[PDB]
Structures are given as structure tokens and as C-alpha cells.
């Protein structure tokens, strides 16, 4: 029912956005059709975990709070709209990051900019529109809601934290002291910045704010339940689950078959490179430096072989055990003020851990 309600609200949001373009922005039907296809191609197809977390958090509070049926329906509708603002925000990131990174495929389909009738000229602007649409949704659907100011303020900080994260991510293969707009950026030779703390900073800002913090805090906001939680705990658990999620994506980029990654070629500061450097002997480090960040398949094969013989699964299982420990602890600390919210965080963890 929740997924069914969530997908139904997409149809209503799309019709509202397209009809407003016609009545207020002088759009013609062909341009409305182009934007309709753009919206469907960039916003749909995923699993909707981010958007659905808003719905799941709100449903949790509905079960333990007294409301009229019309209030229950309004809260669910608000959780669905809020969920779609997050999915559209993600769509904005995916379109822009695919252009920035020169990506080829996204969810077994070509990246949006690669469609023949799209091109980078239109796709950069299509990504800008996707983010504008999140604000149009908020100002229209939440016009008279007491949580409107807090929701816009939170969405803004998360979006800015994400833009900051993308900057940390795309400059992670360069020496900080050499960053200069005037001079072409060489790849690092010492890899001195491939450390656990620097990797944690990249991940924290690039994904955790919008993938985990935003859905959980939006669920609280639409429920008028922000008092039922200690915000310092919500932030701590979101960054922690968020970090684990990225570590899984970094492992998959290298080892998950294409049908089911270019982090080595792009010389990314991945969990695999950081972990490898933290345990490798002098000769393994020299061989890593000689092969990393090269498009040559023979060199990518050497890096993968180094990762395979380094037994990084042991470090991953030890990292996983520590995260299980810390997540269980934070969930317990959340149970004090809100057993309902703690259960929502437990579900988020189960969906991440699986």
C-alpha cells in the first residue's frame, strides 16, 4: 500500500508540474512532452529507498498518534511529496555527476546526457530543472504547513553538503597543496591523502546527508515529531549507516559484474585503495603506485589482483562487525525518546545491511 501510494503521488506531482508550465510559463506541448520523458527517465527506475524512508518514518508515527482520518491521509500525502523531493534531488545529482564524470551507463540504460536528442547542452539544464522542481513541490504542497521553513532550511543544508561532497570526491586523487585553478591538476604520487579520515570526510558529505539524514529528518518534520528525537543521535546514526552504504558501493564498483565500474581508472579515493594502503608492505605500495589511475586494462588487472591477494574481505568483515556494534548502540540510545523512530532506523539499517 505504501509503495502504491508513493507511486500514485508521482503521477499527481508530474501533472501539477507540467500543467503549471503550460498555464504560467507559456510552454508548448512538445516541450512539456520532452520534460515529461526527462522526469520519468531520471526519477523512476530505482528502488526508491530514500523517498520511501520518509513514508515509513511517517507511517511509524501514525500508528502511535491520535489523528482524524483526514489528518492521517494529509500526513501520508506530505510524506510522499517529501519523498519525491528527495528522489528528484537525487535525479539532479545523478544527471550532473554523470556529465561531470563522463559516465556511460546508469541503471542498465545510457546516462541522460547520452540520449541522442538530449546532449550535454540540454542535460546540464535538465539537471538544474530537476532541483528547481523540488522547490516548486515544497512551496505548492507545503504552502501553509508549520514545518515549511524547517524543511526548506534542512533541504538547503543537505543540498549544499552534497555539492561540497562532490568537490571532495572529484579532487580526492590530487595533492591538496597543489589545488590551483591556474594549473592543470596532476594525480597524487605519494597517495598520502588516501587515509581513513579523508575517505570518511568524502563519504560523509557526498552521500550520507541526502541518502540517510534527509529522509529520516523529513519523516520527522512531516510528522511534527522532531521533539521525539535527539538530533545529535539522528545525525550520528545517519553518517554511520551512510558510510557503510558507500563502502558496499565501493566494493561493488570493483568486483560486481557489469550486468549486475571505473574507480581504479579514475584514481578514486575508494575504501578498497584506502584499506589496501593501510596494510600493504613496501613492494605492494610501489606496485599500486605504478598501476593505479590508468585506463590501461593490463594495469587495472594488476590493481584488482593486489586487492584480491590483500584479503580485503577480512578488513570488510571487521569493519562490518564494528558498524553492526555502533548501529545497535545508537538504535538503543534512540529507543529512550522514541521506540517508533528507533524501529524506523532499525528498518533502514536492515535494508542497508542486506
Ligand X SMILES: Cn1cc(C(=O)N2CCc3sccc3C2)ccc1=O
Residue ranges of the binding site for Mg(2+) = 97, 101, 169, 249, 253
CB neighbours (10 Å) of residue 237? Answer: 24
| Residue burial 127-150, b: 16+ Cβ < 10 Å; e: rest | bebbbebbebbbeebbeebebeee
The stretch near ligand X (CB under 6 A) out of 209-217, 218-226, 296-304, 307-315 is 209-217
**Can you read off the three cell numbers belonging to residue 113?**
546526457
Per partner kind, with CB cut-offs from 5 to 8 A, the member of ligand X, a second copy, none near residue 166 is a second copy
What is the C-alpha to C-alpha distance for residues 342 and 346, in angstroms, rounded to an integer? 6
Rank residues 83 and 293 by Cβ distance to ligand X and give the closer one.
83
Q: Which does 120 bind (CB under 5 to 8 A by kind): a second copy, ligand X, none?
A: a second copy
* Chain residue at closest Cβ approach to ligand X: 49
Q: Where are the alpha helices (DSSP H) in 184-337?
A: 196-203, 214-222, 231-255, 271-277, 282-291, 297-309, 312-335
User: Reduced to 3 states, what is the DSSP secondary structure of residue 201?
Assistant: helix
Is residue 191 a contact point for ligand X (CB under 6 A)? Answer: no
3-class DSSP state of 282: helix
Instruction: Find the farthest-apart pair of alpha carbons in the chain and give their distance in angstroms, rounded.
Output: 69
User: Measuring CA to CA, how many Å separate 310 from each of 251, 272, 297, 321?
Assistant: 14, 10, 20, 19
**Smallest distance, ligand X to C-beta of residue 86, A:** 9
Which of residues 8 and 132 has its CB atom nearest to a second copy in the complex? 132
Residues 93 and 206: beta-carbon distance below 8 Å: no
Residues that bind a second copy (CB under 8 A): 21, 25-28, 30-31, 33-35, 37-38, 41, 96, 99-102, 115-122, 124-125, 128-129, 132, 135-136, 139, 149, 152-153, 156, 159-161, 163-164, 166-168, 170-171, 176-177, 179-185, 201, 204-205
Considering beta carbons, is residue 16 or 319 the nearer one to ligand X?
319
Supply the Cα-derived Rg of the chain in whole angstroms. 22
Sites for ligand X among residues 236-275 (CB under 6 A): 245
> How far apart, in Å, are the Cα atoms of 152 and each of 127, 139, 171?
19, 9, 29
Question: Is residue 211 involved in binding ligand X (CB under 6 A)?
Answer: yes
Secondary structure letter of residue 112 according to DSSP: G
With binding defined as CB under 6 A, does residue 2 bind ligand X? no
Rounded-to-integer distance, Cα 112 and Cα 98, Å: 8
Minimum CB separation of residue 160 from a second copy in Å reads 4
Rounded CA-CA distance 195/100 in Å is 24
Cβ–Cβ < 8 Å for 214, 158: yes
Q: What are phi and psi of 258, to 5 degrees?
A: -45, -45
Distance of closest approach, residue 127 Cβ to a second copy, in angstroms: 8
- Residues 313-352: x/- map of binding to ligand X (CB under 6 A)? -----------------------------------x--xx
For a second copy, the closer of residues 128 and 318 by Cβ is: 128
State which residue, 323 or 348, has the beta carbon closest to ligand X. Answer: 348
Looking at the Cβ atoms of 142 and 341, the one nearer to a second copy is: 142
Among 49, 141, 147, 209, contact with ligand X (rule: CB under 6 A) = 49
47 binds, among a second copy, ligand X, none (CB under 5 to 8 A by kind): ligand X
- For the bound state, the minimum distance from the C-beta of residue 259 to a second copy, rounded and expressed in Å, comes to 24
The only residue of 215, 220, 307, 342 in contact with ligand X, by rule CB under 6 A = 215
- Classify residue 331 by its DSSP letter: H
Which residues line the annotated binding site for Zn(2+)?
Answer: 97, 101, 169, 235, 249, 253, 263
Residues near ligand X, by CB under 6 A = 47, 49-50, 53, 211-212, 215, 245, 348, 351-352
Amino acid at each position: 500500500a505504501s509503495m502504491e501510494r508513493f507511486l500514485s503521488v508521482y503521477d499527481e506531482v508530474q501533472a501539477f508540474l507540467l500543467d503549471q508550465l503550460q498555464s504560467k510559463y507559456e510552454i508548448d506541448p512538445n516541450r512539456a512532452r520532452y520534460l515529461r520523458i526527462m522526469m520519468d527517465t531520471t526519477c523512476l527506475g530505482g528502488k526508491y529507498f530514500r523517498g520511501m524512508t520518509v513514508v515509513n518514518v511517517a507511517e511509524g508515527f501514525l500508528a502511535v498518534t491520535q489523528h482524524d482520518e483526514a489528518t492521517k491521509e494529509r500526513i501520508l500525502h506530505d510524506a510522499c511529496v517529501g519523498g519525491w523531493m528527495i528522489e528528484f534531488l537525487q535525479a539532479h545529482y545523478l544527471v550532473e555527476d554523470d556529465i561531470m564524470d563522463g559516465s556511460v551507463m546508469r541503471r542498465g540504460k545510457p546516462c541522460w546526457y547520452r540520449f541522442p536528442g538530449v546532449t550535454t547542452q540540454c542535460a546540464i539544464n535538465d539537471g538544474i530543472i530537476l532541483k528547481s522542481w523540488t522547490q516548486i513541490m515544497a512551496w505548492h504542497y507545503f504552502a501553509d504547513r508549520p514545518f515549511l521553513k524547517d524543511l526548506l532550511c534542512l533541504f538547503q543544508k543537505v543540498d549544499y553538503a552534497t555539492a561540497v561532497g562532490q568537490m571532495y570526491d572529484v579532487t580526492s586523487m590530487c595533492d591538496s597543496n597543489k589545488l590551483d585553478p591556474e594549473v592543470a591538476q596532476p594525480m597524487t604520487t605519494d597517495f598520502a591523502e588516501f587515509t581513513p579520515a579523508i575517505y570518511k570526510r568524502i563519504v560523509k558529505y557526498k552521500t550520507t546527508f541526502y541518502t540517510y539524514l534527509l529522509p529520516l529528518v523529513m519523516g520527522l518534520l512531516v510528522s511534527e515529531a522532531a521533539a521525539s528525537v535527539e538530533m545529535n543521535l539522528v545525525e550520528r546514526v545517519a553518517h554511520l549507516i551512510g558510510e557503510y552504504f558507500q563502502v558496499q558501493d565501493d566494493v561493488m564498483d570493483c568486483f560486481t559484474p557489469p550486468e549486475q565500474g571505473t574507480d581504479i581508472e579514475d584514481a578514486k579515493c575508494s575504501w578498497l585503495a584506502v584499506t589496501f594502503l593501510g596494510k600493504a608492505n613496501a613492494a605492494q605500495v610501489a606496485e599500486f603506485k605504478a598501476n593505479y589511475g590508468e585506463k590501461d586494462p593490463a594495469k587495472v588487472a594488476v590493481v584488482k589482483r593486489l586487492y584480491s591477494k590483500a584479503n580485503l574481505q577480512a578488513d570488510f568483515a571487521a569493519y562490518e562487525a564494528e558498524v553492526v556494534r555502533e548501529v545497535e548502540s545508537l538504535i538503543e540510545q534512540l529507543k529512550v525518546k522514541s521506540p517508533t523512530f528507533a524501529e524506523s532506523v532499525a528498518v533502514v539499517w536492515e535494508k542497508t545491511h542486506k
